[PDB]
Amino acid sequence: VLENRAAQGNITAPGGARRLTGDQTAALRNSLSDKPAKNIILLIGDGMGDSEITAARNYAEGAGGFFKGIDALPLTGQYTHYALNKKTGKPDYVTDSAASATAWSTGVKTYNGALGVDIHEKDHPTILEMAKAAGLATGNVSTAELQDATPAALVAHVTSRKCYGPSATSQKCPGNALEKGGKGSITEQLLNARADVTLGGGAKTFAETATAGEWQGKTLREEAEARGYQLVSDAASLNSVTEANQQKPLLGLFADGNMPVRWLGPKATYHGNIDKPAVTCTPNPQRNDSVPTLAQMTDKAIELLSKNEKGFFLQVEGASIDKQNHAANPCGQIGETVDLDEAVQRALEFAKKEGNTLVIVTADHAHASQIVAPDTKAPGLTQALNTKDGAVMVMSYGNSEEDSQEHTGSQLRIAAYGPHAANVVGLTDQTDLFYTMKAALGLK
Amino acid sequence: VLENRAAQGNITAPGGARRLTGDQTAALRNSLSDKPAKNIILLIGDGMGDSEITAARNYAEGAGGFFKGIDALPLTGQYTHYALNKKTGKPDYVTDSAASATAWSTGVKTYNGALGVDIHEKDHPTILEMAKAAGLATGNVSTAELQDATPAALVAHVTSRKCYGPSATSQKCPGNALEKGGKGSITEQLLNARADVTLGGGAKTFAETATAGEWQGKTLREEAEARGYQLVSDAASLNSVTEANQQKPLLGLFADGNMPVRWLGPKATYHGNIDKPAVTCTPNPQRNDSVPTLAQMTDKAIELLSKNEKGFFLQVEGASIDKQNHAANPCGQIGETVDLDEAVQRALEFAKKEGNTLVIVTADHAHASQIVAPDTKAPGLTQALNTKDGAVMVMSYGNSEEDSQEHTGSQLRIAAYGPHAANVVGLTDQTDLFYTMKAALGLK
Ligand SMILES: [Mg+2]
Ligand SMILES: [Mg+2]
Ligand SMILES: [Zn+2]
Ligand SMILES: [Zn+2]
Ligand SMILES: [Zn+2]
Ligand SMILES: [Zn+2]
């Protein structure tokens, strides 16, 4: 169990590239605890497989460097995230964001596109719901629309991830439609779930009006306010919040859709590593200072949530690693991984200080990006990048002839720190995570 | 630290896909020992990243299944394997088989193509040479030609991995050429190294005659005989060997080049998943019954090597996983992964009984193969396969327009069992592996 895993010295010399400063046995033995966790912070890098982590480290910290957040969790393993074919019930080797999120928040596999329901379309309780029932404080933060699959899986039970608001739900999820006697759209179910802290983008869906029930005729935003929610829309106002609980829950909407990415860089192109010059990422001119970063939202949530004496459960998502991966944009993809690392550092610092906090960092599924040789002649989209090492790294996206690059089914890294973290070691399934968090919290 | 990691029941039901049957904190604790290791068995799946492991498991055991050998090692982590640019000494993000093999066997990073030498072309002792010097028995087994990079790295110190025999060395490694005062070609250095057990393919090069020294004019095969080596060339003759030591060293040459692959299947093609039907692998008909499998060679090696009271170091390589990956042949690649799992099972079975044996399973670098959705329209080479689940899995090779698919730089899985296995957990470097073995054996 080391806090520093960077290369020891001169990487060209014997022992210079080593990351271990000594024997781990004693340290690792000391980090194994089966005492219950008071809190749980689950950080999800959407589409962040081992390849994505490696590319981001190579670029930002150098090959021999190390993410002070992402790479600092002592207990590691690899987990499977295959989904299920709805019709046959047989495995579907490459999952989407909805079925995977449903797996760790519910403990049951499902079909791609499903949120909080099994292949029979039957609802199952999420870890957030259970935590809330036990009296723990709950938080849900993401850089994507709050209706997007990852954050939505914790608070909604819908047959199609496309059922954002009333208008789409009536069409695509008629059985879940409020008018038709259902629990409602994703946004309505989010409002009903009432987590203590909810922060992200997706403000545009709150402009729709409820078609039935108590708050019928009033936009979803008006209903939020009528229900006692504190709504903040920028960094300044989030900062001014001093409490969030069942009486005054916090809801932050920092963008119409997804929050802007941190870095700017060109899109990878065919033969881009050979016909285009190497690129150096730069800050995104379109992201405003008033827009809080993932680390800021994470820190604020930990502060408000930690006021609960029974404990808290918090899920944090670095959403756009996946989205920029689909877009074949190395700079956007890497910047979103660096952003997540900052949020992980905030989580770990708190966990180390508090001492009864289980911190887990993983991804919902693997993705397209691959690190290939500089002179590679590939059929897909490529791009050469100038790294922190002063060397060129080429990234490749070669699994789709369409505009969007696709997910991949490879098992990927899961890492943890704190009480019950041993349950992440070795090979496990994404559904085991649900059970690991449920038992750690004694949420049974 | 469980031995069974298969899905517990109905994967469509709540908790049915779980691989864990309980808390593993206590089990993991007991798995942690820093007592000295008497023996070390290092198994390398050439080019076997997490993607390769997942694809093969999905096909052979089903998504919810598990490799009784490969997936059964309790302590897990991810390690980096970047090489170095010979000129600049800066990292080269994608290593070849020679630079990576040199890193774990020597403890120093080097340039692509180098064996046993650093970037200054200065050689360093290998873990096998250090084991011999300490009095331990040594074994080197592989399914590739014995001159190939992975097995050769343990016994040779050459500036270019292409220096197989006398002829190639004269023009590509003149400073190593015997007639120029060098230590000799890879094969001559292997003969000089005199490991107790050396099994693999590559008989072709033993047909070359030395150009200088005490055995000039004689083929390298004659030199081996002249130096006291027991030469075996099929499974029956291998089985007859009762002892292998410094006076009676064993040299098995089971093929002219690489040993034949276990499974046959067609090569992936452009739009092969949508143009051609799903394939089902079959055993390789052209594979002679008398050619030993990797598990048979591994088993026989353990038997002979364990006669040494001081202990033994054994490296086992499933070489063709990489070669079939380069060839974009899913069935060849998967079959070679299944083949390595059998060898891992023999290693683990021995280790559990013996109790002072450190077993490590990992790869030298990542590769091209990716698991994509069935309806994927990719720019590279694809193929649909019928898995054990009766479902279709599509594999993609999309990082090269040349005849050979390429390695990738992603960090990958390293797993271990036994004394000192804890040094494999968390993020480490491929060079740390050298030190982990050196310390476990007390060779320092
Ligand atoms: Mg997401
Ligand atoms: Mg090899
Ligand atoms: Zn996703
Ligand atoms: Zn995605
Ligand atoms: Zn290799
Ligand atoms: Zn290769």
UniProtKB/Swiss-Prot annotation, chains A, B:
Encoding gene (name): phoA
- Active-site residue numbers: S97
Q: Name one GO molecular function term.
A: hydrogenase (acceptor) activity
Q: Where in the cell is it found?
A: Periplasm
Organism source for this protein? Escherichia coli (strain K12)
Q: What is the lineage of its organism?
A: Bacteria, Pseudomonadati, Pseudomonadota, Gammaproteobacteria, Enterobacterales
Q: What is this protein called?
A: Alkaline phosphatase
For this protein, the record's CDD domains field holds:
ALP
Q: Which ranges does the record mark as transmembrane?
A: none
Cite a single GO BP annotation. Answer: protein dephosphorylation
Q: Name one Pfam family in it.
A: Alk_phosphatase
Listed PROSITE patterns: ALKALINE_PHOSPHATASE
